RNA sequence: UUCCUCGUGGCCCAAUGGUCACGGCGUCUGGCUUCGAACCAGAAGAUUCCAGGUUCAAGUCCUGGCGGGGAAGCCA
RNA sequence: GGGUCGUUAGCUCAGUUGGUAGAGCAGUUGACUUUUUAUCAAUUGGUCGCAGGUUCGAAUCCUGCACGACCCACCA
RNA sequence: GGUUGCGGCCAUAUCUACCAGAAAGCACCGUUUCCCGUCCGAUCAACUGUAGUUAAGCUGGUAAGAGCCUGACCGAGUAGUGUAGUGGGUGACCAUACGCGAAACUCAGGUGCUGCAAUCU
RNA sequence: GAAGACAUUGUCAGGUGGGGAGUUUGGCUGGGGCGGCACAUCUGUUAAACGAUAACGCAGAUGUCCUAAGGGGGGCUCAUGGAGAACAGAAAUCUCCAGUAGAACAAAAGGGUAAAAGCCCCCUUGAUUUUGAUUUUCAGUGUGAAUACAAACCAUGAAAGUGUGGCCUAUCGAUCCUUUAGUCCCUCGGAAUUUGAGGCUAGAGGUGCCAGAAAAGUUACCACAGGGAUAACUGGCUUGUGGCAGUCAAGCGUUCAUAGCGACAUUGCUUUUUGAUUCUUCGAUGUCGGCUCUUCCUAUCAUACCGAAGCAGAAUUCGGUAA
RNA sequence: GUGAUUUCUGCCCAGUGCUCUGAAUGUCAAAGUGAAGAAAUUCAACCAAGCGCGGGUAAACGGCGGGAGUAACUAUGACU
RNA sequence: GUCGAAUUUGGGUAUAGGGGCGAAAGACUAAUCGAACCAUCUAGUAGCUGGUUCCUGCCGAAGUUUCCCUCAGGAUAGCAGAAGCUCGUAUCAGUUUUAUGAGGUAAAGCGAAUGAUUAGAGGUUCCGGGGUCGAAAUGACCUUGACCUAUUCUCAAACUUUAAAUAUGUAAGAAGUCCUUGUUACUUAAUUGAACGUGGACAUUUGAAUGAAGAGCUUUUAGUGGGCCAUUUUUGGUAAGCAGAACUGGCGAUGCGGGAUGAACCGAACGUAGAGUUAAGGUGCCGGAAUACACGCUCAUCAGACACCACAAAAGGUGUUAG
């Protein structure tokens, strides 16, 4: 009953969300975009890896759900639950619509053909770009092995061609792994439940005080 | 809508040529009087075999009309008229408009 | 074409009228007004009524 | 049975025939729509002006 | 069905601007037109009366008429194969000098200028405006400037 | 697919933008009778199928969703 | 053959559009009476056919995997 | 240089928190017969400049301050785009030749200027 | 004999009268019909940064309302949040602080507005007269709407000023006829007076198919001029739908993914189904099926030769070369 | 109009027609009457038939419904 | 089938066209019937189909705007010819530069306004639901939902600070500049201003570039008002040799060489001939032109061979080459 995802497959039109003039649409398949031990710290998953698009397409909700449950099963039962946080880069937003037509033997005489045909809603989808990221995945070097496959084992479920690149880059942060670490040598690398706050040059001084005492604990 | 029964407005009466007081009233029609020169032609027309001779309107569409003043001068008693926009209720005596008060 | 013909009772007289008609002909739709009036004491055959 | 509704084409080339040449300038343009009030004096102005030089070269 | 108004289509076009709404400084009332300046069209969109319509927004005309607080302005517009000439009345908010005649006549004068001291003493003044013309010879030494040899950059992915 | 209609006290329904809203059956208390009915005095109960906008007020005015029912489907 | 769905205690059935099972019939026990049927009270009996997402988790949400119901099906 | 009246450009001028202000000016400040207006002389009205105070207004300064403004071969000649090919690719799209050229980001600097008239240790 | 100034007959007038006569039964339209109005208009977008720009494109709206919801002047500042006061609580009235508009401005939407265009108060009728000029739609016609003046008479404010309806973009109508106001002006043609009638200027009575006919159906008993500008057979493009084959692997299979199956996803092929469009044929290509007859395709039921199994034998299943 | 014989031809006149009432503040043409005016003319009253109002008419044209609860297994519902 | 009767039939007579006749079929009425035949109005009307007769020369289009019961048709504007007229290098230009305006698309942004949206962190409850210690407290501890503060991932045709490229308005002088003083019933406190002038001064470097095949002006009328294709931008649709829009170039209206073959592609547009050189395309043979030269790759039991163009994908291979 679902039209196959070749009829969608690249971008034709432009994007048509949902909004106070759309109103009515169904449900997306996905609902969790991130899996894992996501209340690790920053320090805690080094390394970080990164599911590419080499293509200007869009994937479809359930798409994206199927490739989410394989690699997380995959990465649950190989690794252990607590080895990994995956982390969904994309949300679908883009509306798919659809003309029903009718299928019956002999609809002609009621189907009034192309007359009036603007379509119906019956599906969300995300678009991507060259070079835009899918999925990303942080882990302990000591698992890189597993993650690369694991994704290279979800990659089928994606239409076209994905790569899958290492970065060099620690954890979600946008820092290298030495500089990073010699920032996190001095004081002012300052982590929270998930993500880490940075000290700046910047504002009112007895603020910067108040916070990362030890950078000016010299 | 509501409409004062005075106004004060120019008047062209030759002997006013300013604003003076004037009563309004509605205007209207009056009785359509026979030997008018139309009246006569259509009977003449209508006279004789034939049947209707003059279109007959049927495709009535608006449900309003437009209302007409009637504007008496207090001095010299000429009459002027002036228009309104359309209105679907109108009124002379009109019991003003108080904001203070509730429902 | 479709060709409408509908059965009404007078609102009045309460007497019942139909008719049929090709579905383009504007018959006139008149005009009507509920205003919930009150009633005081009952005179001679007239009434006596009472706005707000 | 419908039919081609609305088109720009060939538009462009039928205006270019003929030069969308300017359509020209002229001393004294004319005085219509200008400030009645100024023009009633101007009239005046060159009244007495045209009698001036008259009587000058008199 | 279809619509086309006399403001259709002015969404953006006549938005004030950012952090510029409210009053219009008083220089524009301070300003003094003259018959024959050329002026451009801007519409105010806080003064509703005597606005342009959306068509002459960023032309120029050439005014010939003054009133008590507005301006006659007059306007060349193409319809069909040929041109014609449209009268405007419009409000000094809309209105503005066009600086391109200021600095114009500046070019006038200085020209007047140049002519009469020239004339002074014949050197043929030469006031003729000339494009960029291509630059003549020069010399360059390297001295403290010894010349960098550069190289193409091999490919890293830097993300 | 379209178009139309309907949803309210336990049941069937009625409803004037101006009062938490009406009838009939039904239910409860007291009375009559050995008892139950019938009969005689009195009462109570409703988020008007789910969200917004209007109004001063919305069952009502209307727009967005749920369930039910009806009509259409012809010239080949 | 394709769509549309619903199957919950021995039987019927509310189930709540995402947290733990409701109601009635049934049967057992007790009170009533010379014992009973009727009447009332209290228990009894439901992992809601197999796998996944999983919110703390899923009969409950949906997805595929059972059985029973609704409509569909050249052409001239 | 300070202050007042009238301004021009309209945040480099705004916002938050503190500190300082000779003289003059400004200000707060005293009173209710008259003109005048309010529930109320609080605003507005009138009189005195006398009884007092820089507390506030205002002005200026301070802040690894928010904001705002300017600039830089920082990002970037990237994104985007006009013209050409019997260019590549199955295709989505992408390079080349002649041209134009950002935004976000980073860093550095600044925190009102000025016209007319009058007055001031 | 009967009947009698009644019948009858003649002329007008009202009623009845598909028995009969004449005529009509809009337009757009992915054929036509049903449906809808894209038929006069307005806001945003499609619209590709001047202007213009289509579709039965998307989200909506108009045939009204207003003596104030118009004009002038003066005073005040809104939504909301925080903190306090008897009944009073989440919502009753009052006070302070913050508050760039997050409120309000008749309506649909978009612009615009803070000593205001918002709220309250005071006075008024410029929503007036005379025709002109200009912008939009445009043929540079009309209609509607709007802009800037001039000549008067006014309103408001102390004044500069503002005011020719609603802050701006929609809210509406030709010829003929009737009717009203002004001039009390012109004519009734042999000469006069009074009724009456006809003229000039300015409005109203309406055409919504909105640049404006007065209008119900059926034909399979049908006719004519035409149309492949246009439908049902066939043919052509596409493949939603139908049919067929792959890639990944959660599970089924006593254990074991791939002996045999295979969800959630995803890549393809065909025109033997049914759809979409209308390119060829309407001065005609005979339009279902059954009977008989020839050839071709492979996506293979059996026969020939082989591989694999959860193939002990038998039976069976998957696959290969093979029409 | 129905179509041998046999056996029967139930209910409905609200609607469309047909027919019969006319004691009547219903409506009405021409003619005739009254008033105003100098006259054209204007305004009234009166008025036949017809229609309106009220009965009959189906072997005249024709029509002849829904929704709930209820019985000692369940189901259905004589009953309400 | 019927054959003694509602039987068959000759002759005479009656009924005649909106009429007759009909045991009822719209049947029959002289091969003519849902209205007989003959002549006349009549050469009836046709927005519809067919045709439209000698040669050569020159110029040479449109399927587009507006209105119409308008959609197979007209009027109107435009494109074209003809007749010319006033003058003699200009009041020019599908062009560039300099100077100066306007725009809200492409891009970008959301720790910037609006709306959507994944995730944790810290506080705050006189104030959500709760539970535990609690009789309670404006008491304490946990949990879930809000609220606030600082962060994080992704978005907008009808969101936005910023903001291109390409297109687009105006100016680059004699109708100009400067000095003096004349007119006016307008304006100013005022010979102050405004507009128009007298007189005087400044010419071929007189105010950027390039071209100008002459410039300007008037009348009249035919045909047209079904379009289509290609690149780029772009709407509905899964898509179409589908339907609908913008700019330019073509076809129609157009031949010639190449793409074997073709209206749109490439090159290039045409009087009749001679000679020379080329465009796009090619040089084994058909077929005019090197089985030229040079560096590499590939063996295919369905190889491959040139844009538009006559298709191919996801996924695999110790085949082979270079990284
Ligand atoms: N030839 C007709 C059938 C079309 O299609
Ligand atoms: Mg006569
Ligand atoms: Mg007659
Ligand atoms: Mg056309
Ligand atoms: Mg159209
Ligand atoms: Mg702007
Ligand atoms: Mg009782
Ligand atoms: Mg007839
Ligand atoms: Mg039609
Ligand atoms: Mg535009
Ligand atoms: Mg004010
Ligand atoms: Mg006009
Ligand atoms: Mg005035
Ligand atoms: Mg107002
Ligand atoms: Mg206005
Ligand atoms: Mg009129
Ligand atoms: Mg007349
Ligand atoms: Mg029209
Ligand atoms: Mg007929
Ligand atoms: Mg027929
Ligand atoms: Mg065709
Ligand atoms: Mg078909
Ligand atoms: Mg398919
Ligand atoms: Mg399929
Ligand atoms: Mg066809
Ligand atoms: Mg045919
Ligand atoms: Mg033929
Ligand atoms: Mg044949
Ligand atoms: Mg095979
Ligand atoms: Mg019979
Ligand atoms: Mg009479
Ligand atoms: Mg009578
Ligand atoms: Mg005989
Ligand atoms: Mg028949
Ligand atoms: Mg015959
Ligand atoms: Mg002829
Ligand atoms: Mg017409
Ligand atoms: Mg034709
Ligand atoms: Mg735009
Ligand atoms: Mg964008
Ligand atoms: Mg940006
Ligand atoms: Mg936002
Ligand atoms: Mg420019
Ligand atoms: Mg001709
Ligand atoms: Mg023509
Ligand atoms: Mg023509
Ligand atoms: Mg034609
Ligand atoms: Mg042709
Ligand atoms: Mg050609
Ligand atoms: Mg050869
Ligand atoms: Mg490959
Ligand atoms: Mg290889
Ligand atoms: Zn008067």
Known sequence: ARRPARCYRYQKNKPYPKSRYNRAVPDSKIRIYDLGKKKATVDEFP?????????????????????????????????????????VRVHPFHVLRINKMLSCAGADRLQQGMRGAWGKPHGLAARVDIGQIIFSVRTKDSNKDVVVEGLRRAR??????????????????????????????????????????????????????????????? | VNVPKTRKTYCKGKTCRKHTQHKVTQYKAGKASLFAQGKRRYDRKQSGFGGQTKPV??????????????????????????????????????????????? | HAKVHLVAID????????????????????????????LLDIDDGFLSLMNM | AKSKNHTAHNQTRKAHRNGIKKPKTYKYPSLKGVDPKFRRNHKHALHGTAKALAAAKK | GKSHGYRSRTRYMFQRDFRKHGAV?????????????????????????????????????????????????????????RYLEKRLNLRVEHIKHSKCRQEFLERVKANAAKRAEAKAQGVAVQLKRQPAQPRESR?????????????????????
């Open chain 1, 47 to 87: 390394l970080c890896v990164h599911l590419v698009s080499n293509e200007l397409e869009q994937l479809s909700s359930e798409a994206l759900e199927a490739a989410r449950i394989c690699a997380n099963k995959y990465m649950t039962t190989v690794s252990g639950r607590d080895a990994f946080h995956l982390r």
């Open chain 1, 156 to 218: 089928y479920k994606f239409p076209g061609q994905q790569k899958i690149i290492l970065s060099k880059k620690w954890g979600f942060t946008n820092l290298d792994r030495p500089e990073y670490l010699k920032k996190r040598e001095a004081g002012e690398v300052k982590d929270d439940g998930a993500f880490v706050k940075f000290l700046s040059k910047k504002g009112s001084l007895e603020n910067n005080i108040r916070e990362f005492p030890e950078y000016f604990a010299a």
């Open chain 2, 57 to 103: 309107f049927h495709k009535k569409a608006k449900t309003t009309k437009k209302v007409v003043l009637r504007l008496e001068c207090v001095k010299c008693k000429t009459r002027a008229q002036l228009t309104l926009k359309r209105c679907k209720h109108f009124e002379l005596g009109g019991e003003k408009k108080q904001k203070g008060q509730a429902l």
């Open chain 3, 11 to 38: 609102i009045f007289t309460g007497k019942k009228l139909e008719d049929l008609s090709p579905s383009t002909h504007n018959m006139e739709v008149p005009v009507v007004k509920r205003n919930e009036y009150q």
């Open chain 5, 25 to 81: 400084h008083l220089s524009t009332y301070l300003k003094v037109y003259k018959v024959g300046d050329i002026v451009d069209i801007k519409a105010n969109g806080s003064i509703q009366k005597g606005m342009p319509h959306k068509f002459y927004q960023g032309k120029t005309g050439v005014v010939y008429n003054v009133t008590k607080s507005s301006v006659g302005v007059i306007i060349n517009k193409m319809v069909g194969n």
């Open chain 5, 139 to 159: 010399i360059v030494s390297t001295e403290g400037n010894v010349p960098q040899t550069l190289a193409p950059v091999p490919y890293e992915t830097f993300i």
